[PDB]
Amino acid sequence: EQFLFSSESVCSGHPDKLCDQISDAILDACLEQDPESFVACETCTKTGFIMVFGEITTKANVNYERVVRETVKEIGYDSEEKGLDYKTMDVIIKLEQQSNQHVDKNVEDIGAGDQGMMFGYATNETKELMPLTHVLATSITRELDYIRMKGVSSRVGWLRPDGKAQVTVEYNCKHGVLIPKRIHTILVSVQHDENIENEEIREFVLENVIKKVCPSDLMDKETRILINPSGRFTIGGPAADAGLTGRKIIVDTYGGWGAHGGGAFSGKDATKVDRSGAYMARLVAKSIVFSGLCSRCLVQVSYGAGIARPLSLYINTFGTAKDGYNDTKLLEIVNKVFDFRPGILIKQLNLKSPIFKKTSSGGHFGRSEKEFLWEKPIILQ
Amino acid sequence: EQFLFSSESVCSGHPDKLCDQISDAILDACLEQDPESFVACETCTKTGFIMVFGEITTKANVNYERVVRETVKEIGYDSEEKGLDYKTMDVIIKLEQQSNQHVDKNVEDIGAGDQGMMFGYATNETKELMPLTHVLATSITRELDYIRMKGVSSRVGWLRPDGKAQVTVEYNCKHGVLIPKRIHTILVSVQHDENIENEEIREFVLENVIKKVCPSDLMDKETRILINPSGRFTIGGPAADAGLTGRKIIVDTYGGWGAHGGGAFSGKDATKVDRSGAYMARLVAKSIVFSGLCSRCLVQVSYGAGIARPLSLYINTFGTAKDGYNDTKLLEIVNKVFDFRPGILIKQLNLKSPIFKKTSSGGHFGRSEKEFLWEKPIILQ
Numbered sequence A, B: 001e002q003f004l005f006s007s008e009s010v011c012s013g014h015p016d017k018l019c020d021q022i023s024d025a026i027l028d029a030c031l032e033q034d035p036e037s038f039v040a041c042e043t044c045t046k047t048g049f050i051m052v053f054g055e056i057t058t059k060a061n062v063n064y065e066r067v068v069r070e071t072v073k074e075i076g077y078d079s080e081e082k083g084l085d086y087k088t089m090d091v092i093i094k095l096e097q098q099s100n101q102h103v104d105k106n107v108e109d110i111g112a113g114d115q116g117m118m119f120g121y122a123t124n125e126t127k128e129l130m131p132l133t134h135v136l137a138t139s140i141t142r143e144l145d146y147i148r149m150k151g152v153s154s155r156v157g158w159l160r161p162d163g164k165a166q167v168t169v170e171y172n173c174k175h176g177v178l179i180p181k182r183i184h185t186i187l188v189s190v191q192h193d194e195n196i197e198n199e200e201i202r203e204f205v206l207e208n209v210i211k212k213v214c215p216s217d218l219m220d221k222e223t224r225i226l227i228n229p230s231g232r233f234t235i236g237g238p239a240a241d242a243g244l245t246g247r248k249i250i251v252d253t254y255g256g257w258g259a260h261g262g263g264a265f266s267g268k269d270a271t272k273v274d275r276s277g278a279y280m281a282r283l284v285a286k287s288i289v290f291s292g293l294c295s296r297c298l299v300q301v302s303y304g305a306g307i308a309r310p311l312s313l314y315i316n317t318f319g320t321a322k323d324g325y326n327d328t329k330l331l332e333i334v335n336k337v338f339d340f341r342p343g344i345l346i347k348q349l350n351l352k353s354p355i356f357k358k359t360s361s362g363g364h365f366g367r368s369e370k371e372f373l374w375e376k377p378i379i380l381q
């Protein structure tokens, strides 16, 4: 009863993640001046251009173009050879007012803005209460990004912004509890200058990234390390591959564990239950595991447009519930403590605050930042 | 142990799904002249425009703008009041050659074009070997679209192209076997002309769609029927809500059941393992369930860029395996019969054929079309 399972992550410079980060830079800019802003900001990119498009209802006075350029600059796209230059690229803005489609309402009464379903997941595999596969892939991309962007030397002058990683873990399953046995395969592909060669890259990545973030007791002489295995990776970013907001939902969330409802997070203010419903669903799953009531947990919420109370809620603990608890009682405990009406949601999690830019690379979940109230678990019994 | 669980679908005029369909209409246009075409065609839309962008290496001579307009016309966007007019919209094309980044190779040697993971899922709930929740939501949108587009007597002159549906089913679980007990909530939001009343819409949708595709023995006087519950829905399409390719990956796949690796399908030729790997993975799960070896099955495959054999393969049958089988034996049987090397994949599933436009609404899986070889199961033992 051993098996292999993989998750991936991407760097901040990946073209899709670049769009997520612009989308949430713009959301934060609106929120800093107008906490009641309605934002649905989508971003796309290809050679020499970025376009932001969608619907914004706000009082904020935001220089969207400036925000775009600044965000691109911080991620490090400052020349055509790297795939995009924030100085020269075209920025196209096509942002309109939210669709038009009376009675006084309290916060409890506020309807969901759309239908949909959202899931939350937690597992006792890691201290983050996230799947180890996801934690390790995301650690590798986050460290590459840190060392390139806010590092300290030309110990990394050669590293360009694009890249990805993928981690395969060998697991045992004993009574529905997942116990990592070893890291099976670690793949990293990173974009680099012309004047460095693939051997130097391997050395750097193994020693300064892989061995830095992957636990040594999970690695052995059979662990397969693949670095830039398809060859050279000097051409990257938008110049090689189009990017769009909302095309990294699994990297954003559980790395193939759990489930997903389909909704993207970035660029959306918290009245989009695709974001706020998934954030509360995480808190619930994490609370249940943190409380010792199970080892793994999946939560589904679903909503109807114009309706305040969710149409449904679902809890699955994969048979791992503690003695005397079961998914029926856990649902009853959840319904006593947690409130998924979207107005309550938003207030509980302080989701009008301009905190979203930090979530748009590195994953939304398993994060330690003090501003992410959905990662601060509640004791339940 | 009872529980509720929801899945959703959208109409082919939904702005995101419009973009999927343009993307695959362009893919098929290329393939029909050049079966070796490399395509990565992304689409977005907002008021008054469509933009097509990405990478295409082909000998095909395709009039991209004409394909965009014909695809929009056929979906029914022929006026600004409906949210888009194929006759007046701007169509912007920003397509480039695929990136650069060699020795003689056989088909078996061809490396995956990217890393990533892919999931296949099957369940004996329905004859399509698909989750009931997804089958029903998708039935409702598909029937709406059919009646609007391919039927069309003034009897539906009032229906507009945008819409969504969501179905919630109450299940019993036994030993990982899902048994639907009743339909709990059906929600449909459809776009309509100004001169029809929300009251006439209910009656039509209930009688000509809902009761037509939802099994009467799963509906009862407690089943909650919600039609346009947020209000009027006259403004829609791109005018009200931006669309992008690859933003309906859960509608495209299993409706929140099973899992997803993150990759979109539409606009991509079959050398993108995000599409071809998921399709093979569906074949495998479906063959296992069809063969009576379990009631439900999830398969994950994972690839490394440049590498022909998958880095990992995973089968989970949720404890529903038949006597004498387990996930270890099933993985050994799969590895005897199926070959996930991408050059072999494509050839066994005939994925160079221009069949993709049919996939881009209505779901990729549970489909009966003769041209979808990933839906034709193998007997295994």
Ligand SMILES: Nc1ncnc2c1ncn2[C@@H]1O[C@H](C[S@+](CC[C@@H](N)C(=O)O)Cc2ccccc2[N+](=O)[O-])[C@@H](O)[C@H]1O
Pocket: A014, A015, A016, A162, A163, A164, A189, A190, A230, A231, A232, A233, A234, A235, A236, A237, A240, A241, A242, B039, B040, B055, B056, B098, B099, B100, B101, B113, B114, B115, B305
């Ligand atoms: N040379 C490279 N080596 C490894 N990974 C790369 C390389 N170039 C891009 N990528 C990364 O792949 C992502 C998706 S790229 C999506 C492909 C697609 N838009 C296409 O047109 O084929 C895939 C890719 C993977 C590996 C090698 C080369 C390519 N490629 O040139 O398309 C892209 O956004 C980058 O993060």
Ligand SMILES: Nc1ncnc2c1ncn2[C@@H]1O[C@H](C[S@+](CC[C@@H](N)C(=O)O)Cc2ccccc2[N+](=O)[O-])[C@@H](O)[C@H]1O
Pocket: A038, A039, A040, A055, A056, A098, A099, A100, A101, A113, A114, A115, A305, B014, B015, B162, B163, B164, B189, B230, B231, B232, B233, B234, B235, B236, B237, B240, B241, B242
């Ligand atoms: N009047 C409506 N009633 C029901 N569904 C609608 C309506 N208008 C659009 N939709 C459907 O919702 C989809 C996402 S729309 C995405 C929201 C977003 N772009 C925004 O800016 O808020 C959400 C929506 C749902 C229900 C009512 C109104 C809205 N809305 O005007 O944003 C959109 O693509 C349509 O399929």
Ligand SMILES: [Mg+2]
Pocket: A016, A242, A243, A244, A247
């Ligand atoms: Mg992408």
Ligand SMILES: [Mg+2]
Pocket: B016, B242, B243, B247
């Ligand atoms: Mg959308």
